Scaffold this active site. Structure first.
Site, mmCIF file in Angstrom:
data_model
loop_
_atom_site.group_PDB
_atom_site.id
_atom_site.type_symbol
_atom_site.label_atom_id
_atom_site.label_comp_id
_atom_site.label_asym_id
_atom_site.label_seq_id
_atom_site.Cartn_x
_atom_site.Cartn_y
_atom_site.Cartn_z
ATOM 1 N N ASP A 3 37.494 -1.199 42.443
ATOM 2 C CA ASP A 3 37.532 0.239 42.706
ATOM 3 C C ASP A 3 38.511 0.619 43.818
ATOM 4 O O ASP A 3 38.995 -0.236 44.554
ATOM 5 C CB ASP A 3 36.137 0.780 43.017
HETATM 6 C C1 LIG Z 1 32.956 5.951 64.044
HETATM 7 C C2 LIG Z 1 32.937 6.688 62.707
HETATM 8 C C3 LIG Z 1 32.377 8.123 62.758
HETATM 9 C C4 LIG Z 1 31.452 8.500 61.575
HETATM 10 C C5 LIG Z 1 32.170 9.120 60.344
HETATM 11 C C6 LIG Z 1 31.299 10.027 59.428
HETATM 12 C C7 LIG Z 1 31.728 10.090 57.930
HETATM 13 C C8 LIG Z 1 30.610 10.470 56.906
HETATM 14 C C9 LIG Z 1 29.762 9.283 56.336
HETATM 15 C C10 LIG Z 1 29.415 9.381 54.820
HETATM 16 C C11 LIG Z 1 30.612 9.591 53.854
HETATM 17 C C12 LIG Z 1 30.454 10.738 52.844
HETATM 18 O O1 LIG Z 1 29.788 11.707 53.091
HETATM 19 S S1 LIG Z 1 31.318 10.606 51.213
HETATM 20 C C13 LIG Z 1 32.230 12.174 50.702
HETATM 21 C C14 LIG Z 1 31.351 13.158 49.896
HETATM 22 N N1 LIG Z 1 31.777 13.431 48.508
HETATM 23 C C15 LIG Z 1 32.075 12.465 47.537
HETATM 24 O O2 LIG Z 1 31.988 11.275 47.838
HETATM 25 C C16 LIG Z 1 32.498 12.927 46.139
HETATM 26 C C17 LIG Z 1 32.588 11.838 45.030
HETATM 27 N N2 LIG Z 1 33.714 10.919 45.240
HETATM 28 C C18 LIG Z 1 34.438 10.341 44.183
HETATM 29 O O3 LIG Z 1 34.072 10.656 43.057
HETATM 30 C C19 LIG Z 1 35.639 9.371 44.455
HETATM 31 O O4 LIG Z 1 35.801 8.675 43.267
HETATM 32 C C20 LIG Z 1 35.408 8.349 45.609
HETATM 33 C C21 LIG Z 1 33.943 8.311 46.015
HETATM 34 C C22 LIG Z 1 36.271 8.790 46.773
HETATM 35 C C23 LIG Z 1 35.835 6.857 45.181
HETATM 36 O O5 LIG Z 1 36.964 6.858 44.482
HETATM 37 P P1 LIG Z 1 37.646 5.300 43.766
HETATM 38 O O6 LIG Z 1 36.395 4.457 43.754
HETATM 39 O O7 LIG Z 1 38.141 5.815 42.442
HETATM 40 O O8 LIG Z 1 38.705 4.874 44.757
#
Ligand SMILES: CCCCCCCCCCCC(=O)SCCNC(=O)CCNC(=O)[C@H](O)C(C)(C)COP(=O)(O)O
Ligand SMILES: CCCCCCCCCCCCCCCCCC(=O)OC[C@H](COP(=O)([O-])OCC(O)COP(=O)([O-])OC[C@@H](COC(=O)CCCCCCCCCCCCCCCCC)OC(=O)CCCCCCCCCCCCCCCCC)OC(=O)CCCCCCCCCCCCCCCCC
Ligand SMILES: CCCCCCCCCCCCCCCCCC(=O)OC[C@H](COP(=O)([O-])OCC(O)COP(=O)([O-])OC[C@@H](COC(=O)CCCCCCCCCCCCCCCCC)OC(=O)CCCCCCCCCCCCCCCCC)OC(=O)CCCCCCCCCCCCCCCCC
Ligand SMILES: CCCCCCCCCCCCCCCCC[C@@H](O)O[C@H](CO[C@H](O)CCCCCCCCCCCCCCC)COP(=O)(O)OCC[N+](C)(C)C
Ligand SMILES: CCCCCCCC/C=C\CCCCCCCC(=O)OC[C@H](COP(=O)(O)OCCN)OC(=O)CCCCCCC/C=C\CCCCCCCC
Ligand SMILES: CCCCCCCC/C=C\CCCCCCCC(=O)O[C@H](COC(=O)CCCCCCC/C=C/CCCCCCCC)COP(=O)(O)OCCN
Lengths: 128, 178, 124, 175, 104, 110, 459, 55, 62, 88, 67, 80
Positions: free
Chosen positions: J43
């Site tokens: 992925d």
């Molecule tokens: C020290 C660090 C500080 C903390 C940072 C905080 C960050 C937030 C933590 C949680 C992360 C989120 O919310 S996650 C963001 C919220 N929305 C989504 O995930 C929508 C669905 N994504 C997809 O469909 C894509 O395919 C994808 C998943 C990109 C993969 O793609 P490949 O597989 O085709 O590469």
């Protein structure tokens, strides 16, 4: 959920915190494509002269010419005496002069009236 | 820095960049490798939790909240590679990079040394001179009437052709010029 | 520290002021005080080129130490007895100053106490 | 050295203590001093004496210039330009000489401060006192003339000062 | 100019500018040898409050420490020859007031 | 201070050069046995800087702290000086811990 | 004194009778020999001036100015012969004639005994300068610049003439020796106030004083290289020399009439020094640094003390040399890239290593690094100003801080960073340019060992 | 100081992750002195040098 | 060649400076001023042969 | 002196070493020209971790625009050689 | 000297560097022990601090509150 | 020069804190696919390391032995 970050003049809002990059219309995408096209044509026009073997010299940049001309020679022809312009000119140009005149005249009047009454301790003051 | 930029980044690109940035800052916070591995696996799980969300409004909202989380939780002193834009050796060797056209101004006594180098340079200059018109012709034919939409350049499509606008890419000074 | 706490937190009128001191005469309680003796003359100290701060009732031991350091120059570990004597004399001077501080403190705590007790018999 | 007058640049008689070693360890300063004398000072004195023999073969003299005394600005008439010129030149020469007098006194003061070590505040009282008087007189004479000074302005300053002194003396006599 | 992408291929890498693009009126102010407007980890006014508060607190406590100094429980340091009157400037023709130190 | 501060900077430069111009302590792992002479020099320098008894640092710094304690001094200044004395050992510990102890954190091509 | 004037006059027929390809050689050699002859005037007395004749005299104030004036002509000829290559023979000779006439007028101006003759020569210096600017300048603004140069000066000096012939009608003479010996105080009256203004404003415009300094950023920028060199090095010092000469008649009126000018100078120092921080034109930055430096000379002359006069003389000489060198250094880059924009050509230290050393030394002398005579003059003026009022140290201190900022900025923009990629016509430095820089900088450093030669009559 | 710093440094080996304090931000970013004093005074001075002094 | 460096970089400079200080700088008054040497009780002067008296019968508190 | 003159074979060896140390990709199957998606079924998120591992291995940072494209070990080797000016 | 990179192994060490490092650490520790054995007073002091409470009222000239 | 890479099959997370990370992540339903890549940081001469106090007392033993022998020699030699 977290302490919110607020932008300022000297510490601006980041791109990832800007809600504009998250509410995208088709017109927004068209504008971004147009911007890319403008940048791209300029890049190609620059690289054609840059890579040219025959060219010897400095490539003249109209943007730099416009910047310098606007910063110097375009200013007076575009000036109008307005209450804001008149007030800022009078303050910023006249006020410091009388402020410093008052300060220095007060200090020197004090010093001269002290010299007159013989209380300054000017001993060893050979050089002036 | 070698690929042409696009008009915008897609949602997938934004979430991937967020993933890499958050992982790097997490590694900055977790100095030790085992602790970094633990919390990086936790981070990957947190990213995978919404891997296949199909509601683009919900996905955008989740990405935005993730950005707001990162900005509050970022390391104020993140680790930077020494030659990266914020690093301690970013542009350290730029004072040593000298353009090759300077070699044209060498005194003939200077060119008396290195005869082979300057013969090879004359061959390179002749090659550059002989292929310029073909490259210009290729660029004009390939590009659209309005102008080029993107900064991507075409390869050489004939046999004895060189890719257009190649001289300054090929004759880069060096990364350690001296 | 205690002396700082008792002054800044307790009653400051019960303890001496380091700047305005002493406030009692040198013979207020003592019956006969002999004047403090000095060994090194003014000319000896001047010839020695000692620092003004250094010219204290302990000056003769410092002069001896300086002379010993100069006489045995290469052996910079020979002037131990002289340095010890000078340090002992300075220690004695410091405990004398501490004794003066304590004397002033107890005189000052006795004085206001005795006046307030004289006022205590004057209520009626 | 006989180069300069010892009465105008005095110094104390230079009391130096005799070396009185106490330890049996060798003195490195003595060994280094012997090495310096044998390797540095002796060739220097040889070269200097050669230079002096070469100088003694040719002897010539230069003379300090003597200037006559001419009438001062007080004796000059209002518009007599030649006497004013001579008086002004003499006044300028006297001003330069006074500057150098103050310079000599200041050099004495500095040398005393360096020589006396930690006891300079007491052992340089005479030099400080001499400088205070010379400085007061120089300040009375030339202070506040400004750029474009002259003998006429100095005379006007002196006359103003004498008028002030006369008024102050008349004020005291009435008590 | 520091806010622009350093991974782009600028015509002028040091200035991060592209040939022919419009130039900001205040470019020489923003050349990144100079005024920086990059986003910071702590937002502006958050930093100002903390810095000003720290400096004001240090100044106030230095003033307080001046009001309530620290010292040792001792009397004044005693000096023999009229408190070194002749050494501390001189004036030998005055014969100052005896300052007398007695053993305790 | 000249002696041990210059030598501390020299030890830091040795670490940086041996690690391909890396200056972040987060990428310096266990150098205690990999650079034994540099470790000895930096440990001795930090001990001298911290006022360890009978070292070069001790013959001045420890005399300074006593002098402030035995003076008519601003109380806040005295408190600040003592706290700073503690923080000196704190950051010497930070350097030694993150640069010489633990496991390697630098790239694999040693 | 004719032993300098007459050889200078012989430079005209020598130039006009030379071969088409020998004018530069002959002019350079013989102007250098005239400088050698001019060095004899530095032997000055301690009491009065060198009164050659009824017409010409030399003082410890005018001798260093004369030496700098004669020394500047060979440097101007060296700096001019590159951009005048394609010129015809007769126009080259006309340009050299303009320079020779300018030198002749300046030499007589600095040594005239009588103030009307001084005025006539000090005004005659306008014609060759204006012809140079408006005939050999490169751009269309050079015409306007010329007008600004012509009418700012004359509007100041026309009252001065009216004052001077007035003074001779009441005192009987304009001879400077007689004026100094027979000096009388100026009463406190409206007529005396306007006579004071008429005697001062002409020199103030030449300095120039902040407020009437507009002509200078035009004239210096649009002029050819020799024009800007002579404008900065010598023509600005005419105002300082004239003010120093004419102040004797002014007292005691100067004590209160100097306040507006002291305020204008002490604030315009800051104003122009800060203007240098945001200047896209390199030659314009160099021009504004001159106004910032001459404000200090104005302050020193107005406060009227021996330390201030010494400092003003030293600063005038040091600024002449440094500003001439900076204008030449900018011209070296202009003749390569044909633009005066400071950010157009960058990273030049990589491509021109020794000219970078020249740039560094010029910038160091501009910010008055000790023990350069720039610093000597500046520090003397600052000490005298402190005596005049202690608060001045704030303004003076601020100016020093700003001067170092725009100097090194000028150094960092043009020499450091990375060279612009497109430019590819940056040829190695010529021996002519390197020698032109050396002949600017070596006398400056050599004057440190004998500063009394440039400290004026108050030493 | 030795003991407290060593203990707080050994604490970093534990498998816990928490967000930094405001005091840590103050210390690591140098009291925000460069972030404020190298941006506000320089900006205002360089802005006045052009807006009013020059223009 | 064995020790040529120590004579062209040390011996020659110290020859010129010693010659310069001894015969030119010290020709003018007050050019080289030295701190007066310390004198202690019991010292013998090399100039007058004077002996400084000892320090007044110490309390001998030992 | 400084670091040895790193060559093309060394870059390839280190890239394949790092890949073979990844638990997701088996050593026998992996090949220099193997696509990370078609060949290994990986992925986009997984790909980012490989790029970061290469950065940690060679000690330099690859920009995100450049990084996404690299789908084969040969592509990574060519990118690194272009950056470090490696011609054998 | 010639030591080569080792790629994920402990680096090659020489005998001289280790014995020098150990020798100098041992020298520092011997110096500390020697100076503490000979100059203890530099750390533990040499004179005791007198307690003011142990001083009698006659040692300091104090009257018994009735005069 | 003229050297090649050690075998990649020797880097096992066994016995190292990477095992602990693996167990803690297994107790959460996840896996750590990069552990072996870090294994070399715990394998060879990097397997064991000194503590802070042991680093501070790096040469205490030998210096102490020299100190005690010197004291023993001089204390008995001082009894002349
Ligand atoms: C020290 C660090 C500080 C903390 C940072 C905080 C960050 C937030 C933590 C949680 C992360 C989120 O919310 S996650 C963001 C919220 N929305 C989504 O995930 C929508 C669905 N994504 C997809 O469909 C894509 O395919 C994808 C998943 C990109 C993969 O793609 P490949 O597989 O085709 O590469
Ligand atoms: C204290 C020093 C002792 C000196 C001993 C005697 C030396 C005499 C030298 C006199 C100066 C020469 C004239 C300057 C132009 C040089 C021409 C040139 O291009 O040479 C290239 C030549 C060949 O090199 P290259 O490889 O071709 O160069 C390629 C690039 O150009 C690359 O070139 P680069 O990168 O090497 O650049 C050249 C180099 C050097 O270039 C220069 O900077 C020359 C100018 C120096 C700065 C002057 C301007 C600043 C204002 C102060 C002015 C002071 C003047 C003093 C009197 C001078 C009289 C001549 O740059 C620097 O080193 C930094 C300069 C900044 C100096 C900072 C210190 C300033 C104060 C020093 C104290 C001054 C008073 C001393 C006495 C105090 C009481 C004892 O290089 C040299 O030969 C060396 C240059 C000389 C360096 C001397 C630096 C100290 C000068 C002190 C002033 C003179 C004092 C003399 C009396 C004793 C003191
Ligand atoms: C012997 C007689 C005397 C005995 C005294 C009693 C015994 C000692 C008492 C306790 C002393 C403190 C001991 C612990 C220190 C704190 C360490 C800690 O864990 O920090 C936790 C936390 C930061 O931890 P974190 O962010 O979770 O760290 C994340 C990672 O660890 C990030 O990891 P990393 O790798 O970035 O590492 C971070 C770094 C440390 O992380 C930090 O950056 C924060 C550390 C701050 C420590 C500050 C201590 C000294 C502060 C002096 C400030 C003067 C007043 C300033 C007031 C300004 C007000 C605007 O870790 C270290 O490198 C070691 C830290 C230093 C340890 C050794 C400290 C020794 C000096 C202090 C003790 C002195 C004892 C001798 C005194 C003798 C006197 C006669 O900071 C605190 O919460 C406490 C800091 C101490 C001051 C806080 C005061 C509250 C501030 C706001 C008050 C309200 C103001 C209202 C407005 C008023 C306007 C007028
Ligand atoms: C931008 C660059 C321009 C150049 C700057 C030149 C500056 C010229 C300023 C001249 C300095 C002073 C001039 C006259 C001295 C005093 C002027 C007046 O303000 O003071 C009072 C003068 O009294 C009244 O105020 C009369 C003056 C009022 C009418 C004049 C208008 C001034 C307004 C400012 C105009 C701007 C000047 C520049 C024009 C372009 C003094 O009180 P008083 O005791 O009674 O008079 C004593 C004078 N005596 C001895 C001759 C009799
Ligand atoms: C009397 C004068 C007192 C001083 C008053 C304030 C002076 C203001 C000076 C204005 C100068 C503006 C023009 C400078 C040009 C722009 C510039 O320098 O760039 C800013 C440059 C770049 O930023 P960096 O953080 O270094 O790097 C980030 C890049 N990634 O930073 C700077 O150098 C700015 C320096 C400004 C300092 C001003 C603050 C100092 C004031 C101190 C006052 C207290 C004095 C202490 C007294 C102690 C008692 C004895
Ligand atoms: C680049 C711009 C520079 C501007 C310079 C212009 C200002 C020059 C100063 C005034 C010039 C005229 C002064 C006249 C010469 C003085 C000679 C003199 O002493 O005559 C006065 C007379 O003085 C005058 O008449 C002068 C009055 C003004 C007439 C012209 C007005 C000009 C404008 C005045 C204000 C401007 C001056 C300052 C402006 C500065 C520049 C902006 C007294 O003589 P008596 O009549 O005999 O008196 C004694 C017996 N009764």
């Amino acid at each position: 959920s977290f302490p919110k970050y607020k932008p300022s003049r000297l510490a601006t809002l980041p791109a990832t915190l800007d809600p504009a990059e998250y509410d995208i219309s088709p017109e927004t995408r068209k504008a971004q494509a147009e911007r890319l096209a403008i940048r791209s044509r300029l890049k190609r026009e620059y690289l054609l002269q840059y890579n040219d073997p025959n060219r010897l010299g400095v490539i003249e940049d109209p943007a730099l010419i416009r910047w310098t001309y606007a910063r110097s020679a375009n200013i007076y022809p575009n000036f109008r005496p307005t209450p804001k312009t008149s007030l800022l000119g009078a303050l910023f140009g006249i006020g410091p002069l009388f402020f410093w005149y008052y300060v220095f005249k007060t200090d020197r009047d004090k010093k001269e009236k002290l010299i007159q009454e013989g209380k300054l301790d000017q001993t060893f003051n050979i050089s002036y | 820095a070698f690929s042409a930029p696009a008009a915008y980044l897609t949602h997938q690109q934004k979430v991937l960049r967020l993933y890499k940035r958050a992982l790097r800052h997490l590694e900055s916070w977790c100095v030790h490798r085992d602790k970094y591995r633990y919390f990086a696996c936790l981070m990957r799980a947190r990213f995978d939790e919404h891997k296949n969300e199909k509601d683009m409004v919900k996905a955008t909202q989740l990405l935005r909240q993730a950005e707001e989380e990162f900005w509050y939780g970022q390391h104020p002193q993140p680790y930077i590679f020494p030659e990266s834009p914020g690093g301690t050796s970013y542009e350290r060797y730029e004072c040593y990079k000298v353009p090759e056209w300077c070699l044209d101004d060498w005194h003939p006594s200077e060119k008396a040394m290195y005869p082979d180098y300057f013969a090879k340079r004359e061959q390179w200059k002749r090659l550059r001179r002989e292929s310029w018109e073909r490259e210009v012709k290729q660029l004009q034919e390939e590009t659209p009437p309005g102008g080029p939409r993107t900064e991507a350049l075409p390869p050489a499509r004939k046999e004895g052709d060189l890719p257009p606008l190649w001289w300054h890419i090929v004759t880069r000074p060096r990364e350690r010029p001296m | 520290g205690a002396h700082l706490a008792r002054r800044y937190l307790g009653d400051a009128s019960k303890e001496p002021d380091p700047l305005r001191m002493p406030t009692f005469p040198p013979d207020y309680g003592f019956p006969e005080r002999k004047e403090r003796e000095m060994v090194a003359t003014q000319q000896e100290m001047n010839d020695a080129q000692l620092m003004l701060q250094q010219r204290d009732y302990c000056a003769h031991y410092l002069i001896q130490l300086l002379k010993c350091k100069r006489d045995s120059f290469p052996n910079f570990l020979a002037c131990k007895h002289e340095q010890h004597d000078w340090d002992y004399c300075e220690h004695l001077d410091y405990v004398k100053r501490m004794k003066e501080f304590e004397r002033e403190r107890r005189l000052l705590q006795r004085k206001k106490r005795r006046e307030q007790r004289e006022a205590e018999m004057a209520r009626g | 050295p006989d180069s300069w007058d010892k009465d105008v640049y005095p110094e104390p008689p230079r009391r130096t203590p005799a070396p009185a070693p106490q330890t049996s360890l060798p003195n490195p300063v003595t060994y280094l001093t012997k090495i310096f004398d044998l390797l540095v000072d002796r060739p220097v004195t040889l070269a200097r004496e050669f230079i002096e023999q070469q100088h003694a073969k040719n002897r010539y003299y230069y003379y300090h210039r003597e200037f006559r005394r001419v009438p001062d600005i007080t004796e000059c008439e209002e518009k007599d330009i030649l006497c004013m010129f001579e008086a002004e030149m003499q006044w300028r020469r006297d001003y330069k000489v006074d500057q150098e007098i103050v310079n000599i006194i200041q050099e004495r003061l500095k040398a005393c401060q360096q020589r006396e070590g930690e006891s300079y505040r007491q052992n340089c009282a005479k030099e400080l006192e001499q400088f205070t008087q010379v400085s007061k007189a120089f300040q009375d004479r030339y202070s506040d003339l400004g750029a474009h000074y002259s003998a006429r302005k100095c005379l006007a300053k002196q006359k103003q000062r004498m008028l002030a002194e006369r008024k102050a003396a008349k004020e005291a006599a009435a008590a | 100019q520091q806010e622009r992408d350093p991974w782009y291929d600028w015509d002028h890498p040091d200035l991060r500018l592209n040939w022919g693009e419009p130039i900001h009126w205040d470019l020489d102010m923003y050349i990144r040898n100079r005024v920086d407007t990059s986003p910071t980890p702590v937002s502006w006014n958050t930093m100002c409050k903390h810095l000003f508060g720290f400096v004001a607190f240090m100044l106030f406590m230095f003033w307080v420490g001046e009001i309530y100094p620290s010292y040792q429980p001792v009397g004044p340091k005693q000096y023999p020859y009229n408190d070194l009157y002749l050494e501390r400037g001189g004036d030998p023709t005055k014969e100052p007031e005896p300052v007398v130190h007695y053993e305790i | 201070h000249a002696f041990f501060k210059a030598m501390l900077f020299m030890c830091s430069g040795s670490i940086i050069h041996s690690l391909n111009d890396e200056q972040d302590i987060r990428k310096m792992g266990g150098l205690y046995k990999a650079m034994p002479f540099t470790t000895t020099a930096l440990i001795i320098g930090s001990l001298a800087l911290t006022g360890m008894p009978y070292l070069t640092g001790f013959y001045s710094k420890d005399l300074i702290i006593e002098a402030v304690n035995m003076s008519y001094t601003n109380a806040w200044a005295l408190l600040m000086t003592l706290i700073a004395t503690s923080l000196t050992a704190a950051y010497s510990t930070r350097i030694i811990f993150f640069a010489f102890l633990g496991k390697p954190r630098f790239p694999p091509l040693v | 004194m004719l032993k300098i004037i007459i050889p200078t006059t012989m430079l005209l027929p020598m130039t006009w009778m030379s071969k088409h390809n020998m004018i530069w050689i002959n002019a350079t050699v013989h102007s250098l020999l005239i400088s050698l002859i001019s060095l004899s005037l530095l032997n000055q007395l301690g009491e009065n001036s060198l009164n050659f004749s009824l017409t010409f005299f030399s003082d410890s104030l005018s001798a260093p100015l004369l030496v700098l004036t004669t020394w500047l002509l060979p440097l101007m000829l060296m700096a001019s012969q590159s951009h005048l290559s394609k010129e015809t023979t007769t126009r080259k000779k006309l340009y050299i004639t303009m320079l020779i006439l300018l030198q002749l007028f300046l030499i007589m101006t600095f040594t005239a005994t009588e103030l009307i003759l001084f005025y006539i020569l000090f005004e005659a210096t306008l014609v060759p300068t204006l012809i140079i600017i408006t005939r050999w300048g490169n751009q269309t603004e050079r015409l306007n610049a010329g007008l600004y140069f012509l009418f700012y000066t004359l509007a100041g000096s026309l009252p001065l003439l009216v004052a001077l012939v007035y003074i001779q009608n009441t005192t009987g003479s304009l001879n400077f020796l007689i004026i100094h010996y027979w000096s009388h105080p100026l009463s406190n009256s409206w007529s005396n106030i306007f006579m004071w203004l008429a005697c001062i404003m002409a020199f103030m415009v030449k300095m120039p004083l902040y407020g009437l300094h507009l002509w200078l950023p035009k004239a210096h920028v649009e002029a050819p290289i020799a024009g800007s060199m002579v404008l900065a090095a010598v023509l600005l010092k005419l105002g300082g020399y004239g003010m120093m000469r004419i102040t004797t008649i002014l007292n005691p009126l100067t004590n209160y009439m100097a306040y507006p000018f002291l305020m204008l100078s002490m604030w315009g120092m800051i104003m122009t020094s800060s203007i240098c921080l945001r200047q896209t034109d390199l030659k314009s930055l160099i021009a504004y640094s001159s106004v910032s430096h001459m404000a200090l000379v104005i302050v020193a002359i107005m406060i009227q003390t021996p330390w201030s006069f010494m400092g003003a003389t030293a600063l005038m000489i040091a600024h002449g040399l440094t500003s001439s060198m900076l204008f030449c250094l900018a011209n070296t880059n202009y003749e390569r890239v044909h633009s005066r924009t400071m950010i157009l050509a960058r990273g030049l230290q990589t491509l021109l290593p020794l000219m970078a050393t020249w740039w560094l030394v010029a910038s160091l002398t501009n910010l008055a690094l000790p023990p350069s005579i720039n610093l000597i003059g500046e520090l003397f003026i600052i000490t005298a100003s402190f005596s005049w009022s202690n608060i001045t140290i704030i303004l003076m201190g601020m100016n020093m801080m700003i001067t170092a900022l725009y100097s090194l900025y000028m150094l960092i923009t043009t020499q450091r960073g990375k060279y612009t990629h497109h430019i590819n016509n940056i040829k190695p430095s010529f021996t002519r340019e390197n020698a032109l820089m050396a002949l600017h900088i070596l006398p400056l450093l050599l004057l440190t060992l004998n500063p009394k030669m440039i400290l004026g009559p108050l030493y | 100081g030795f003991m407290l710093a060593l203990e707080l440094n050994n604490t970093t080996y534990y498998l816990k992750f928490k967000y930094p304090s405001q005091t840590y931000k103050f210390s690591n970013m140098l009291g925000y002195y460069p972030s404020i004093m190298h941006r506000l005074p320089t900006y205002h001075n360089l802005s006045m040098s052009q807006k009013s002094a020059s223009s | 060649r064995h020790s040529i460096f120590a004579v062209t970089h040390v011996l020659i400079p110290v020859w010129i400076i010693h010659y310069y200080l001894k015969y030119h700088v010290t020709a003018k008054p007050y050019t080289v001023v030295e701190r007066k040497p310390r004198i202690f009780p019991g010292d013998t002067i090399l100039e007058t042969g004077e002996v400084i008296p000892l320090m007044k019968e110490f309390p001998d508190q030992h | 002196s400084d670091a040895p003159p790193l060559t093309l074979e060394a870059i390839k060896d280190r890239v394949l070493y790092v890949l073979k140390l990844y638990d997701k990709i088996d050593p026998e199957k992996l090949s220099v020209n193997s696509h990370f998606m078609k060949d290994l079924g990986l992925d986009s998120l997984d790909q980012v971790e490989i790029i970061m591992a290469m950065e940690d291995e060679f000690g330099f940072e690859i920009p995100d625009i450049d990084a996404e494209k690299l789908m084969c070990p040969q592509e990574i080797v060519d990118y690194i050689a272009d950056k470090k000016d490696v011609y054998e | 000297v010639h030591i080569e990179p080792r790629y994920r192994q402990f680096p090659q060490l020489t005998r001289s560097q280790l014995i020098q490092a150990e020798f100098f650490s041992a020298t520092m520790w011997f110096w500390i022990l020697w100076r503490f054995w000979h100059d203890s007073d530099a750390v533990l002091g040499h004179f005791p601090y007198p307690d003011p409470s142990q001083w009698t009222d006659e040692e300091l000239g104090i009257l018994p509150d009735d005069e | 020069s003229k050297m090649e890479l050690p075998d990649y099959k020797q880097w096992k997370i066994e016995g190292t804190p990477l095992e602990t990370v693996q167990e803690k992540l297994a107790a959460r339903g996840l896996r750590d696919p990069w552990g072996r890549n870090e294994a070399w940081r715990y394998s060879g001469g990097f397997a064991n390391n000194v503590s802070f106090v042991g680093a501070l007392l790096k040469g205490f033993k030998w210096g102490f032995a020299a100190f005690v022998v010197a004291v023993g020699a001089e204390y008995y030699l001082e009894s002349q």
